[PDB]
Amino acid sequence: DESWRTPAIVQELAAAGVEEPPSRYVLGEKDRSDELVAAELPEPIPVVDLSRLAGADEAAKLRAALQNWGFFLLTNHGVETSLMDDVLNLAREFFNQPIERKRKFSNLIDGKNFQVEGYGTDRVVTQDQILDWSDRLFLRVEPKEERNLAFWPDHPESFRDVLNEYASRTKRIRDDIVQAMSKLLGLDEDYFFDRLNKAPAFARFNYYPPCPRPDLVFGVRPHSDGSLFTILLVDEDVGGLQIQRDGKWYNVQVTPNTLLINLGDTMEVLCNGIFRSPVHRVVTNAERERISLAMLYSVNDEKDIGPAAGLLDENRPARYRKVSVGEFRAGIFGKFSRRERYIDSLKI
Ligand SMILES: O=C(O)CCC(=O)C(=O)O
Numbered sequence: 360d361e362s363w364r365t366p367a368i369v370q371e372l373a374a375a376g377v378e379e380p381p382s383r384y385v386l387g388e389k390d391r392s393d394e395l396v397a398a399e400l401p402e403p404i405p406v407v408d409l410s411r412l413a414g415a416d417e418a419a420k421l422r423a424a425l426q427n428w429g430f431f432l433l434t435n436h437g438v439e440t441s442l443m444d445d446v447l448n449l450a451r452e453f454f455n456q457p458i459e460r461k462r463k464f465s466n467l468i469d470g471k472n473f474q475v476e477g478y479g480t481d482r483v484v485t486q487d488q489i490l491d492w493s494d495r496l497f498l499r500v501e502p503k504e505e506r507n508l509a510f511w512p513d514h515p516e517s518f519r520d521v522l523n524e525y526a527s528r529t530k531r532i533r534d535d536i537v538q539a540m541s542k543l544l545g546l547d548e549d550y551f552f553d554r555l556n557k558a559p560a561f562a563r564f565n566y567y568p569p570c571p572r573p574d575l576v577f578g579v580r581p582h583s584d585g586s587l588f589t590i591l592l593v594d595e596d597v598g599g600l601q602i603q604r605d606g607k608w609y610n611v612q613v614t615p616n617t618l619l620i621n622l623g624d625t626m627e628v629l630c631n632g633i634f635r636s637p638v639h640r641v642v643t644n645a646e647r648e649r650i651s652l653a654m655l656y657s658v659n660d661e662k663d664i665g666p667a668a669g670l671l672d673e674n675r676p677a678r679y680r681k682v683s684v685g686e687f688r689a690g691i692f693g694k695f696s697r698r699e700r701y702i703d704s705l706k707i
């Protein structure tokens with residue numbers, strides 16, 4: 360048919376009281392023999408203090424987090440509690456609007472033609488592609504000139520100004536993180552800032568509805584982010600996010616009022632694998648929905664994507680192929696709905 364080109368909004372399937380997840384969402388036995396259960400984090404959760412980041416000991420904790428896990432929880436980040444709560448509250452108010460009004464922001468233009476920006480789910484490439492048990496509102500926040508406000512929700516009316524304020528506050532955290540990472544790597548901070556100059560940045564509001572069979576679906580499939588890194592905010596996280604380290608899966612819980620920073624595939628290539636981009640996924644539960652916001656920061660199209668020359672001395676040579684931004688972006692976009700990691704094809 361053509362029906363597989365336009366997937367359903369899963370929040371409405373859950374509201375309908377659908378007895379079992381439709382076959383379009385059910386994972387194959389090979390991909391869920393895991394029981395979708397993960398172990399607990401053996402070491403205590405990597406947590407970095409931003410207010411003490413200039414200190415030598417916090418920079419050491421940051422190094423151990425990026426080399427061993429590729430992510431960490433950020434505390435004392437300065438973002439006010441009221442602001443973080445209001446971004447998630449207004450997001451919940453949008454997902455709770457009547458379906459007819461939400462469909463005016465659909466990423467299926469006129470209900471047929473797919474684009475990334477908008478409300479819906481990710482691209483369905485083939486008819487037998489397994490769908491995730493979630494919806495997402497995907498919006499470009501940078502550069503501010505390229506914002507397409509027709510896809511920003513108008514109700515609640517505070518959505519546009521509160522997201523614009525949260526975006527500017529996390530871009531400030533973003534700059535504080537690359538500075539500390541540049542110290543760890545021994546490079547000039549201007550190496551990353553030149554590639555982040557007027558680079559695309561996106562806000563992904565995720566809604567994971569409750570699922571009648573949590574052991575049969577993924578809230579979001581296993582994936583590594585393709586950005587430089589991501590700033591993740593979760594509303595009263597009871598569980599769901601699972602991060603993979605050397606093949607094993609571990610439950611990680613973004614505690615309230617803290618932010619989770621995880622590296623993307625772009626950073627792993629630029630840093631020649633000194634740090635690793637963590638693969639992660641979200642499992643559902645039969646009881647309660649889950650809402651998260653991910654701020655994704657990629658690099659601009661100026662310079663190609665390859666190991667930084669300042670890191671390629673005689674001792675540690677290039678571990679990845681240098682590649683153009685275009686084909687790098689095309690590889691991340693195409694392999695997201697597939698099993699094979701795109702970044703593994705760039706390794707030498
Ligand atoms: O396919 C997309 O646009 C988003 C997928 C994703 O989570 C990522 O590549 O970081």
Ligand SMILES: O=C(O)CCC(=O)C(=O)O
Nearest residue numbers: 563565584600641651653
């Ligand atoms: O909702 C989460 O905790 C995962 C966010 C995520 O992986 C993404 O949107 O790229």
Ligand SMILES: [Co+2]
Nearest residue numbers: 582583584639
């Ligand atoms: Co992700």
